[PDB]
Amino acid sequence: VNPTVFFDIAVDGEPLGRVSFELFADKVPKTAENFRALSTGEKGFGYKGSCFHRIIPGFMCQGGDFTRHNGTGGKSIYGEKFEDENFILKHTGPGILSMANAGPNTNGSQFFICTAKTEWLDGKHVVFGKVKEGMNIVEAMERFGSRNGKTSKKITIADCGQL
């Protein structure tokens, strides 16, 4: 009964594969709903066509800036920002989905998928989902990243929605 959403990933326009996510609406319903709605586009804006602007192998993939495509933008379905809902869930290993932010209570649309255990983020970033299928596609995404985060090819969300 937790929702599952998918991203279809492309590399320089060429399909790579699909990664689906379980969203923990039972624990962080407000945060889960923001990501779900941005994935379906039902409010008139969202993730479809946006890029992953920062990929650091052995750490994480960051995306969700659909307004400036570079980490400075994005917005939530609740307004420009919203609060840290809770910190019940921890960054326990690869596949964790967690909100990017710029201080307390500044969640927007940007998120990251962890590709490592990142315990130092506990209590500072809201964990709200996990990769359910296609972790191999995330691992293939990593290979286009670099130490400073710049990607060698353009990694986009070609399609997305709810399963």
Swiss-Prot record:
Q: Which residues carry this modification: N6-acetyllysine?
A: 27, 43, 75, 81, 124, 130, 132
Outcome reported for the amino acid change (mutating residue 120 to E): Loss of peptidyl-prolyl cis-trans isomerase activity
Task: Report the residues modified as N-acetylvaline.
Answer: 1
Reported impact of residue 124 to Q: Acetylation-mimetic mutant; no effect on its interaction with TARDBP
Q: Which residues carry this modification: Phosphoserine?
A: 76
Keyword Signal appears in the UniProt entry: no
- BP terms from Gene Ontology: activation of protein kinase B activity; apoptotic process; cell adhesion molecule production; cellular response to oxidative stress; endothelial cell activation; leukocyte chemotaxis; lipid droplet organization; negative regulation of oxidative stress-induced intrinsic apoptotic signaling pathway
What is known to happen upon mutating residue 120 to A? Answer: 200-fold decrease of sensitivity to CsA. Reduced ability to stimulate MAPK/ERK phosphorylation
Record note on modification: Acetylation at Lys-124 markedly inhibits catalysis of cis to trans isomerization and stabilizes cis rather than trans forms of the HIV-1 capsid. PPIA acetylation also antagonizes the immunosuppressive effects of cyclosporine by inhibiting the sequential steps of cyclosporine binding and calcineurin inhibition. Acetylation at Lys-124 favors its interaction with TARDBP.
The places in or outside the cell where this protein is found are:
Cytoplasm; Secreted; Nucleus
Task: Note the Pfam families from the entry.
Answer: Pro_isomerase
Activity control mechanisms: Binds cyclosporin A (CsA). CsA mediates some of its effects via an inhibitory action on PPIase.
Q: Which residues are glycosylated?
A: 107
Task: Give the chief site where it resides.
Answer: cytoplasm
The alphabetical list of record keywords is: Acetylation, Apoptosis, Cytoplasm, Glycoprotein, Host-virus interaction, Isomerase, Isopeptide bond, Nucleus, Phosphoprotein, Rotamase, Secreted, Ubl conjugation
Example of a GO MF term: cyclosporin A binding
Q: Where is this cross-link: Glycyl lysine isopeptide (Lys-Gly) (interchain with G-Cter in ubiquitin)?
A: 27
List each copy of the PPIase cyclophilin-type domain by range.
6-162
EC number(s): the record gives: 5.2.1.8
Variant or mutagenesis effect after changing residue 68 to A: No effect on peptidyl-prolyl cis-trans isomerase activity. Reduced interaction with BSG/CD147 and ability to induce leukocyte chemotaxis
Family to which this protein belongs: Belongs to the cyclophilin-type PPIase family. PPIase A subfamily.
Protein role:
Catalyzes the cis-trans isomerization of proline imidic peptide bonds in oligopeptides. Exerts a strong chemotactic effect on leukocytes partly through activation of one of its membrane receptors BSG/CD147, initiating a signaling cascade that culminates in MAPK/ERK activation. Activates endothelial cells (ECs) in a pro-inflammatory manner by stimulating activation of NF-kappa-B and ERK, JNK and p38 MAP-kinases and by inducing expression of adhesion molecules including SELE and VCAM1. (Microbial infection) May act as a mediator between human SARS coronavirus nucleoprotein and BSG/CD147 in the process of invasion of host cells by the virus.
Description of how the protein assembles with itself and partners:
Interacts with protein phosphatase PPP3CA/calcineurin A. Interacts with PRPF19 isoform 2 (via N-terminus). Interacts with isoform 2 of BSG/CD147. Interacts with FOXO1; the interaction promotes FOXO1 dephosphorylation, nuclear accumulation and transcriptional activity. Interacts with integrin ITGA2B:ITGB3; the interaction is ROS and peptidyl-prolyl cis-trans isomerase (PPIase) activity-dependent and is increased in the presence of thrombin. Interacts with MAP3K5. (Microbial infection) Interacts with HIV-1 capsid protein.
Q: What is this protein called?
A: Peptidyl-prolyl cis-trans isomerase A
Q: Which organism is it from?
A: Homo sapiens (Human)
Q: What is the lineage of its organism?
A: Eukaryota, Metazoa, Chordata, Craniata, Vertebrata
User: Gene of origin?
Assistant: PPIA
